[PDB]
PDB file of C-alpha atoms and ligand atoms in Angstrom:
ATOM      1  CA  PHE A   1     -63.537 109.564  27.465  1.00 31.83           C
ATOM      2  CA  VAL A   2     -65.721 110.414  30.508  1.00 32.59           C
ATOM      3  CA  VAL A   3     -66.900 113.545  28.693  1.00 33.16           C
ATOM      4  CA  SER A   4     -69.057 112.659  25.692  1.00 33.49           C
ATOM      5  CA  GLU A   5     -69.277 114.738  22.530  1.00 35.22           C
ATOM      6  CA  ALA A   6     -72.753 115.926  23.509  1.00 34.97           C
ATOM      7  CA  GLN A   7     -71.477 116.989  26.944  1.00 37.92           C
ATOM      8  CA  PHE A   8     -68.507 118.833  25.437  1.00 38.43           C
ATOM      9  CA  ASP A   9     -70.914 120.594  23.075  1.00 37.23           C
ATOM     10  CA  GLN A  10     -73.033 121.832  26.003  1.00 37.70           C
ATOM     11  CA  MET A  11     -69.940 122.887  27.967  1.00 34.13           C
ATOM     12  CA  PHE A  12     -68.698 125.267  25.238  1.00 37.27           C
ATOM     13  CA  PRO A  13     -71.669 126.577  23.198  1.00 37.78           C
ATOM     14  CA  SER A  14     -69.862 129.729  21.997  1.00 37.37           C
ATOM     15  CA  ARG A  15     -66.610 127.999  20.976  1.00 40.77           C
ATOM     16  CA  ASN A  16     -64.446 128.851  18.009  1.00 39.31           C
ATOM     17  CA  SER A  17     -64.978 125.981  15.581  1.00 38.70           C
ATOM     18  CA  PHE A  18     -61.164 125.488  15.671  1.00 40.65           C
ATOM     19  CA  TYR A  19     -61.618 123.648  18.968  1.00 36.81           C
ATOM     20  CA  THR A  20     -62.905 120.209  18.070  1.00 37.40           C
ATOM     21  CA  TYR A  21     -64.004 117.333  20.315  1.00 38.09           C
ATOM     22  CA  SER A  22     -62.103 115.016  17.932  1.00 33.82           C
ATOM     23  CA  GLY A  23     -58.918 117.054  18.497  1.00 32.78           C
ATOM     24  CA  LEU A  24     -59.357 116.630  22.246  1.00 34.87           C
ATOM     25  CA  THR A  25     -59.939 112.884  22.001  1.00 31.90           C
ATOM     26  CA  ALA A  26     -56.865 112.582  19.738  1.00 32.11           C
ATOM     27  CA  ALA A  27     -54.812 114.371  22.420  1.00 30.14           C
ATOM     28  CA  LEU A  28     -55.767 111.989  25.236  1.00 29.21           C
ATOM     29  CA  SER A  29     -53.250 109.314  24.207  1.00 28.74           C
ATOM     30  CA  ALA A  30     -50.368 111.653  25.175  1.00 25.95           C
ATOM     31  CA  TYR A  31     -51.523 111.410  28.818  1.00 24.68           C
ATOM     32  CA  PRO A  32     -53.385 108.105  29.299  1.00 24.12           C
ATOM     33  CA  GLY A  33     -53.706 108.740  33.075  1.00 22.83           C
ATOM     34  CA  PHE A  34     -55.675 111.934  32.459  1.00 25.90           C
ATOM     35  CA  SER A  35     -59.326 111.539  33.515  1.00 27.54           C
ATOM     36  CA  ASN A  36     -58.476 107.821  33.842  1.00 30.19           C
ATOM     37  CA  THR A  37     -57.032 107.663  37.364  1.00 30.38           C
ATOM     38  CA  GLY A  38     -59.072 106.837  40.486  1.00 27.29           C
ATOM     39  CA  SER A  39     -62.842 106.326  40.716  1.00 26.76           C
ATOM     40  CA  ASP A  40     -65.241 107.394  37.945  1.00 25.77           C
ATOM     41  CA  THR A  41     -66.102 110.303  40.299  1.00 26.66           C
ATOM     42  CA  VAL A  42     -62.476 111.466  40.328  1.00 26.60           C
ATOM     43  CA  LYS A  43     -62.157 110.936  36.544  1.00 23.92           C
ATOM     44  CA  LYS A  44     -65.149 113.193  35.939  1.00 22.32           C
ATOM     45  CA  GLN A  45     -64.017 115.794  38.512  1.00 23.02           C
ATOM     46  CA  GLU A  46     -60.638 115.910  36.771  1.00 25.18           C
ATOM     47  CA  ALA A  47     -62.172 116.276  33.289  1.00 25.79           C
ATOM     48  CA  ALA A  48     -64.530 119.005  34.536  1.00 23.90           C
ATOM     49  CA  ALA A  49     -61.686 120.812  36.291  1.00 23.51           C
ATOM     50  CA  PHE A  50     -59.508 120.791  33.170  1.00 19.53           C
ATOM     51  CA  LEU A  51     -62.316 121.995  30.939  1.00 16.40           C
ATOM     52  CA  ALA A  52     -63.475 124.688  33.443  1.00 14.11           C
ATOM     53  CA  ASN A  53     -59.923 126.093  33.608  1.00 15.19           C
ATOM     54  CA  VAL A  54     -59.725 125.975  29.809  1.00 14.35           C
ATOM     55  CA  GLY A  55     -63.053 127.867  29.625  1.00 13.69           C
ATOM     56  CA  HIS A  56     -61.702 130.561  31.897  1.00 10.86           C
ATOM     57  CA  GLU A  57     -58.442 131.049  29.990  1.00  9.60           C
ATOM     58  CA  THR A  58     -59.931 131.172  26.519  1.00  8.98           C
ATOM     59  CA  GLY A  59     -63.372 132.795  27.000  1.00 11.57           C
ATOM     60  CA  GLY A  60     -65.381 129.599  26.638  1.00 12.21           C
ATOM     61  CA  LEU A  61     -63.032 128.526  23.800  1.00 11.01           C
ATOM     62  CA  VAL A  62     -64.024 131.629  21.770  1.00 13.16           C
ATOM     63  CA  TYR A  63     -60.324 132.601  21.551  1.00 14.19           C
ATOM     64  CA  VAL A  64     -57.333 130.699  20.168  1.00 14.04           C
ATOM     65  CA  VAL A  65     -54.646 133.395  20.547  1.00 13.19           C
ATOM     66  CA  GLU A  66     -53.782 135.868  23.260  1.00 12.35           C
ATOM     67  CA  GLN A  67     -55.867 138.998  22.595  1.00 13.45           C
ATOM     68  CA  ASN A  68     -53.559 141.663  24.025  1.00 17.24           C
ATOM     69  CA  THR A  69     -51.166 142.011  21.090  1.00 15.54           C
ATOM     70  CA  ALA A  70     -49.083 144.646  22.934  1.00 16.40           C
ATOM     71  CA  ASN A  71     -47.797 141.803  25.121  1.00 16.05           C
ATOM     72  CA  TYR A  72     -46.503 139.656  22.206  1.00 15.53           C
ATOM     73  CA  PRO A  73     -42.798 140.682  22.332  1.00 15.01           C
ATOM     74  CA  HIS A  74     -42.826 139.987  26.106  1.00 16.04           C
ATOM     75  CA  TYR A  75     -42.578 136.162  25.958  1.00 19.72           C
ATOM     76  CA  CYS A  76     -39.006 135.816  24.735  1.00 18.94           C
ATOM     77  CA  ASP A  77     -36.641 134.698  27.499  1.00 20.73           C
ATOM     78  CA  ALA A  78     -33.439 135.770  25.767  1.00 19.57           C
ATOM     79  CA  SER A  79     -31.261 133.967  28.373  1.00 19.16           C
ATOM     80  CA  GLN A  80     -32.077 130.624  26.779  1.00 19.52           C
ATOM     81  CA  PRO A  81     -29.202 129.299  24.635  1.00 21.93           C
ATOM     82  CA  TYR A  82     -31.790 128.262  22.014  1.00 22.29           C
ATOM     83  CA  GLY A  83     -33.343 131.740  22.037  1.00 22.62           C
ATOM     84  CA  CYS A  84     -36.539 132.598  20.169  1.00 23.42           C
ATOM     85  CA  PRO A  85     -35.952 131.240  16.634  1.00 20.21           C
ATOM     86  CA  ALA A  86     -39.508 131.818  15.374  1.00 21.54           C
ATOM     87  CA  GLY A  87     -39.232 135.472  16.460  1.00 24.42           C
ATOM     88  CA  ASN A  88     -39.108 137.515  19.674  1.00 24.36           C
ATOM     89  CA  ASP A  89     -42.872 138.147  19.479  1.00 24.69           C
ATOM     90  CA  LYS A  90     -43.996 134.643  18.444  1.00 26.35           C
ATOM     91  CA  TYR A  91     -44.327 132.881  21.853  1.00 25.72           C
ATOM     92  CA  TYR A  92     -47.583 134.514  22.931  1.00 24.79           C
ATOM     93  CA  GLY A  93     -50.532 132.594  24.353  1.00 24.59           C
ATOM     94  CA  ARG A  94     -52.076 129.929  22.149  1.00 25.62           C
ATOM     95  CA  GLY A  95     -54.639 127.175  22.654  1.00 26.07           C
ATOM     96  CA  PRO A  96     -56.613 125.869  25.644  1.00 26.90           C
ATOM     97  CA  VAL A  97     -54.098 126.831  28.382  1.00 21.47           C
ATOM     98  CA  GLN A  98     -52.704 129.820  26.478  1.00 18.94           C
ATOM     99  CA  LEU A  99     -49.223 128.298  26.267  1.00 17.76           C
ATOM    100  CA  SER A 100     -46.680 131.165  26.481  1.00 16.26           C
ATOM    101  CA  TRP A 101     -42.856 131.684  26.545  1.00 17.85           C
ATOM    102  CA  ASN A 102     -40.111 130.205  24.392  1.00 18.47           C
ATOM    103  CA  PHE A 103     -39.022 127.927  27.262  1.00 17.79           C
ATOM    104  CA  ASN A 104     -42.551 126.447  27.547  1.00 17.91           C
ATOM    105  CA  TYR A 105     -42.838 125.857  23.798  1.00 16.76           C
ATOM    106  CA  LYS A 106     -39.458 124.113  24.128  1.00 14.92           C
ATOM    107  CA  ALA A 107     -40.470 121.948  27.134  1.00 18.98           C
ATOM    108  CA  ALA A 108     -43.928 121.125  25.781  1.00 17.44           C
ATOM    109  CA  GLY A 109     -42.540 120.228  22.350  1.00 20.25           C
ATOM    110  CA  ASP A 110     -39.830 118.028  23.850  1.00 17.81           C
ATOM    111  CA  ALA A 111     -42.464 116.165  25.885  1.00 15.41           C
ATOM    112  CA  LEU A 112     -44.930 115.796  23.000  1.00 13.93           C
ATOM    113  CA  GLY A 113     -42.400 114.950  20.264  1.00  9.77           C
ATOM    114  CA  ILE A 114     -43.284 118.104  18.289  1.00  8.80           C
ATOM    115  CA  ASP A 115     -40.929 120.953  17.403  1.00  8.84           C
ATOM    116  CA  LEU A 116     -42.979 123.717  18.969  1.00  9.40           C
ATOM    117  CA  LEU A 117     -39.979 125.966  19.598  1.00 10.96           C
ATOM    118  CA  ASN A 118     -39.375 126.263  15.848  1.00 13.39           C
ATOM    119  CA  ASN A 119     -43.054 125.954  14.843  1.00 16.99           C
ATOM    120  CA  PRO A 120     -45.082 127.664  17.609  1.00 16.86           C
ATOM    121  CA  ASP A 121     -47.992 128.410  15.231  1.00 18.75           C
ATOM    122  CA  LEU A 122     -48.854 124.686  15.328  1.00 18.09           C
ATOM    123  CA  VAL A 123     -50.562 125.417  18.676  1.00 19.00           C
ATOM    124  CA  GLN A 124     -52.972 127.862  16.946  1.00 16.76           C
ATOM    125  CA  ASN A 125     -53.316 125.953  13.685  1.00 16.52           C
ATOM    126  CA  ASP A 126     -53.912 122.366  14.765  1.00 15.92           C
ATOM    127  CA  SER A 127     -56.634 121.268  17.209  1.00 18.50           C
ATOM    128  CA  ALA A 128     -54.919 118.079  18.406  1.00 19.72           C
ATOM    129  CA  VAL A 129     -51.629 119.895  19.045  1.00 20.74           C
ATOM    130  CA  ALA A 130     -53.494 122.669  20.888  1.00 23.55           C
ATOM    131  CA  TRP A 131     -55.246 120.174  23.150  1.00 22.69           C
ATOM    132  CA  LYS A 132     -51.997 118.224  23.679  1.00 19.63           C
ATOM    133  CA  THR A 133     -50.302 121.397  24.993  1.00 21.78           C
ATOM    134  CA  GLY A 134     -53.211 121.815  27.442  1.00 19.68           C
ATOM    135  CA  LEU A 135     -52.797 118.252  28.665  1.00 20.15           C
ATOM    136  CA  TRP A 136     -49.005 118.705  28.892  1.00 16.11           C
ATOM    137  CA  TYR A 137     -49.492 121.677  31.213  1.00 20.00           C
ATOM    138  CA  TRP A 138     -52.234 119.987  33.252  1.00 22.48           C
ATOM    139  CA  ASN A 139     -50.381 116.732  33.747  1.00 25.42           C
ATOM    140  CA  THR A 140     -46.748 117.855  34.164  1.00 25.18           C
ATOM    141  CA  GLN A 141     -46.564 121.505  35.262  1.00 20.92           C
ATOM    142  CA  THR A 142     -47.074 123.107  38.679  1.00 18.39           C
ATOM    143  CA  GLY A 143     -46.987 126.678  37.356  1.00 17.20           C
ATOM    144  CA  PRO A 144     -47.126 129.340  40.110  1.00 13.52           C
ATOM    145  CA  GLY A 145     -48.468 126.509  42.361  1.00 13.48           C
ATOM    146  CA  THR A 146     -46.934 123.546  44.261  1.00 12.87           C
ATOM    147  CA  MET A 147     -48.470 120.535  42.497  1.00 12.33           C
ATOM    148  CA  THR A 148     -49.697 119.550  39.041  1.00 11.65           C
ATOM    149  CA  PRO A 149     -53.411 120.114  38.442  1.00 12.01           C
ATOM    150  CA  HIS A 150     -53.618 116.375  37.677  1.00 12.19           C
ATOM    151  CA  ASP A 151     -52.188 115.608  41.123  1.00 11.11           C
ATOM    152  CA  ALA A 152     -54.505 118.127  42.814  1.00 10.86           C
ATOM    153  CA  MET A 153     -57.592 116.393  41.453  1.00  7.87           C
ATOM    154  CA  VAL A 154     -56.517 112.750  41.768  1.00  3.06           C
ATOM    155  CA  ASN A 155     -54.958 113.112  45.265  1.00  3.33           C
ATOM    156  CA  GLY A 156     -57.810 115.235  46.626  1.00  3.60           C
ATOM    157  CA  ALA A 157     -56.078 118.583  47.204  1.00  3.74           C
ATOM    158  CA  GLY A 158     -59.081 120.033  45.346  1.00  3.19           C
ATOM    159  CA  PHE A 159     -60.092 122.359  42.531  1.00  2.00           C
ATOM    160  CA  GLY A 160     -58.633 125.452  44.216  1.00  2.00           C
ATOM    161  CA  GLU A 161     -55.073 124.201  43.650  1.00  2.59           C
ATOM    162  CA  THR A 162     -55.783 124.019  39.919  1.00  2.00           C
ATOM    163  CA  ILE A 163     -56.793 127.718  39.941  1.00  2.00           C
ATOM    164  CA  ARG A 164     -53.466 128.511  41.589  1.00  2.05           C
ATOM    165  CA  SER A 165     -51.478 126.585  38.956  1.00  2.00           C
ATOM    166  CA  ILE A 166     -53.379 127.930  35.947  1.00  2.00           C
ATOM    167  CA  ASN A 167     -52.744 131.647  35.761  1.00  2.00           C
ATOM    168  CA  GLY A 168     -54.057 132.249  39.278  1.00  2.00           C
ATOM    169  CA  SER A 169     -51.241 134.339  40.782  1.00  2.00           C
ATOM    170  CA  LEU A 170     -53.274 137.595  40.705  1.00  2.00           C
ATOM    171  CA  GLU A 171     -56.508 135.865  41.757  1.00  2.00           C
ATOM    172  CA  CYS A 172     -55.683 133.534  44.633  1.00  2.16           C
ATOM    173  CA  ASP A 173     -54.868 134.693  48.185  1.00  3.95           C
ATOM    174  CA  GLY A 174     -57.697 137.252  48.042  1.00  4.37           C
ATOM    175  CA  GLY A 175     -56.245 138.873  44.892  1.00  2.93           C
ATOM    176  CA  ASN A 176     -59.474 138.727  42.882  1.00  4.55           C
ATOM    177  CA  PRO A 177     -62.418 137.132  44.767  1.00  2.00           C
ATOM    178  CA  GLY A 178     -64.716 137.682  41.757  1.00  2.01           C
ATOM    179  CA  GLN A 179     -62.497 135.717  39.349  1.00  2.00           C
ATOM    180  CA  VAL A 180     -61.981 132.907  41.868  1.00  2.00           C
ATOM    181  CA  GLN A 181     -65.758 132.649  42.428  1.00  2.00           C
ATOM    182  CA  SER A 182     -66.396 132.706  38.665  1.00  2.00           C
ATOM    183  CA  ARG A 183     -63.915 129.853  38.206  1.00  2.00           C
ATOM    184  CA  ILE A 184     -65.479 127.800  41.007  1.00  2.00           C
ATOM    185  CA  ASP A 185     -68.981 128.419  39.606  1.00  2.00           C
ATOM    186  CA  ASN A 186     -67.902 127.090  36.183  1.00  2.00           C
ATOM    187  CA  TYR A 187     -66.384 123.982  37.775  1.00  2.00           C
ATOM    188  CA  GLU A 188     -69.612 123.379  39.734  1.00  2.00           C
ATOM    189  CA  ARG A 189     -71.669 123.704  36.538  1.00  2.00           C
ATOM    190  CA  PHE A 190     -69.431 121.216  34.727  1.00  2.00           C
ATOM    191  CA  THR A 191     -69.452 118.672  37.546  1.00  2.00           C
ATOM    192  CA  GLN A 192     -73.255 119.086  37.711  1.00  2.00           C
ATOM    193  CA  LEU A 193     -73.450 118.382  33.964  1.00  2.00           C
ATOM    194  CA  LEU A 194     -71.318 115.233  34.431  1.00  2.00           C
ATOM    195  CA  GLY A 195     -73.483 114.211  37.428  1.00  2.00           C
ATOM    196  CA  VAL A 196     -70.769 114.269  40.089  1.00  2.00           C
ATOM    197  CA  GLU A 197     -70.050 116.153  43.336  1.00  2.00           C
ATOM    198  CA  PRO A 198     -67.444 118.948  43.061  1.00  2.00           C
ATOM    199  CA  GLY A 199     -65.433 117.764  46.077  1.00  2.00           C
ATOM    200  CA  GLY A 200     -63.795 120.026  48.644  1.00  2.00           C
ATOM    201  CA  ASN A 201     -61.160 122.775  48.847  1.00  2.00           C
ATOM    202  CA  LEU A 202     -62.671 124.595  45.873  1.00  2.00           C
ATOM    203  CA  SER A 203     -61.051 127.946  46.515  1.00  2.00           C
ATOM    204  CA  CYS A 204     -57.618 129.600  46.753  1.00  2.00           C
TER     205      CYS A 204
HETATM  206 ZN1  LIG B   1     -50.066 132.439  48.172  1.00  2.00          ZN
HETATM  207 ZN1  LIG B   2     -58.348 134.684  35.409  1.00  2.00          ZN
END
């Protein structure tokens, strides 16, 4: 992995001890192309971009679960034939990308070979599963964007497209210049740590 344990440690000094480097390395096999496509520069830019986004969404990995508990019953899409079997309020944000919604627990679980729809707490109770859901989103989902974050970094669309795809709908397009700048600054710090250039098109 192009991020060493010592680098990961420096990246997230306030982290909840739930989030382990070993859990992350265990997760990598689910997406062997992740941080392993293109030049070593691109590999490191991708790793830094993933981890910067993760830092933003979880408060430097301090948090495992979504903190606004009032929102919990919100993530049940009752139109799904498979419904919300764990409970209407059990599909709240968990793990490095704050995986949310019954339909995303379903899709992620199907892709990973884990029954996350019927066991969503696995994402808050197991480090490897948590990291695997982050890599599932990064490598397969466009979110509110037009490309996967993996594609943005490997094909050179730039870091800004990853902001758009990872909970950036209220921040991009001039929505929240402060949050966009904060996200860019974190990515620049992580690329600096890894000893690579950040590349272009940093903003959205
Ligand atoms: Zn737009
Ligand atoms: Zn944000």
